[PDB]
A paper describes a structure:
Unexpectedly however, the structures revealed a previously undescribed monomeric form of SaCodY and a dimeric EfCodY. Nevertheless, ligand-free SaCodY can also form dimers, as confirmed with SEC-MALS. This suggests that a monomer–dimer equilibrium may be a factor in regulation of SaCodY activity. The asymmetric unit of the ligand-free SaCodY crystals contains two well-structured monomers with their GAF and DBD domains tightly packed head-to-tail. Therefore, it is possible that the dimer observed in the SEC-MALS experiments of ligand-free SaCodY is the non-biological head-to-tail dimer observed in the crystals. To determine if the DBD domain of ligand-free SaCodY is flexible in solution, we used hydrogen deuterium exchange mass spectrometry, which did show the DBD domain to be flexible. In more detail, in absence of ligands, Arg69 in the H3–H4 linker, extends its side chain into the vacant Ile binding site making a hydrogen bond to the main chain carbonyl group of Val97. In the ligand-free structure, elevated B-factors suggest that the H1-H2 loop region (residues Leu14-Phe24) has increased flexibility. Superimposition of monomeric ligand-free and dimeric-activated SaGAF domains shows that residues Gln15-Lys18 in the ligand-free domain cause steric clashes with the linker helix and S3–S4 loop of protomer B. This may explain the monomeric state of ligand-free SaCodY.
In Gram-positive pathogens such as Staphylococcus aureus (Sa) and Enterococcus faecalis (Ef), the pleiotropic transcription factor CodY plays a key role in integrating metabolism and virulence factor expression. CodY DNA-binding is activated by two types of ligands: branched chain amino acids (BCAAs, i.e. isoleucine, leucine, and valine) and, in most cases, guanosine triphosphate, GTP. Each 30 kDa protomer comprises the N-terminal ligand-binding domain called GAF (cGMP-specific phosphodiesterases, adenylyl cyclases and FhlA). The GAF domain is connected by an extended linker helix to the C-terminal DNA-binding (DBD) domain that contains a winged helix-turn-helix (wHTH) motif.
Residue numbers in the entry: 1 to 256
Amino acid sequence: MSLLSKTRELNTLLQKHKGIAVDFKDVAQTISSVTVTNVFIVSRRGKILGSSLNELLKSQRIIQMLEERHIPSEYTERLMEVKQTESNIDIDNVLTVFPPENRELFIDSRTTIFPILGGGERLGTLVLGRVHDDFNENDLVLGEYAATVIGMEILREKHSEVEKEARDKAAITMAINSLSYSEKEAIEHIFEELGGTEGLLIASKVADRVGITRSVIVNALRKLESAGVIESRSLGMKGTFIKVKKEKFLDELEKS
C-alpha cells in the first residue's frame, strides 16, 4: 500500500461526520491498521483514551505479551514531558512503549511519540510502536496527520466539557443562593424521602410526615426548576416526578 493510498484511507475514515461521537478506540484501530503499528492515544493527564495492537505479527509470543501488558501510569505521565516529535526510539530508551523485561524479543523495536497540540496547549500524546521495523519519512507524515486529527477532536471535546461544567456550577450556585433557610431544609428532607436523586414525591403526604407545609415544598422545587437544577412534572391530582439534572447539586447544597 502506497503513501497516497494510506492517505486516502485516513482522510475517508478519520473525517468527522455530523451525527457521530468520536470513539478513540476505533480511531486507534484505524491508525494501527493503516500504518501497521501499535497505537496508544494518551490524554495530557496520562489516560489511555484508545489503543490497538498490530495483531498481524507472526510471533504469538510477542502478541500475547503485548496483549497482557498494561501501559504503566508512570510511563504515560512521562509523555507530557516530551515536547516535540521523537521518532525511532529504541528499546533501551526510557521512552520506549514496549515491555522492558524481554529485551531480546523487542531488541529491534522502534517507538515514535507525537505531541498532540491544539490552541497553544498540550492536549495529549500519540504513541506508535513497531516490533521489528523503522519509521520512515512517509510513516512520520502519516503519524503527524493522525496526531493533528486527534487534537482537533479532543479540542472540540474539551471546549464543550468546560462550558457544560461551568454552566452546571453556575446553575447550582444560583439555585442554592435563591433558596431561603426553610426552603433549603425542605429540599434536604425531600431527597431524604426519595432516597436518591430521582423518584415520585407525594408532597402533601411528605409535608405531613416532616412537619413542613406543602407550600414550602412547592416553592423550593419551583426555585430549583427555575434554576434548571431539576425537572418537575405533576402526575395527576397528586404526586410530582422529581429528577436532579445537576449531579453535584446535593453535594454542594450540604456545603451551603
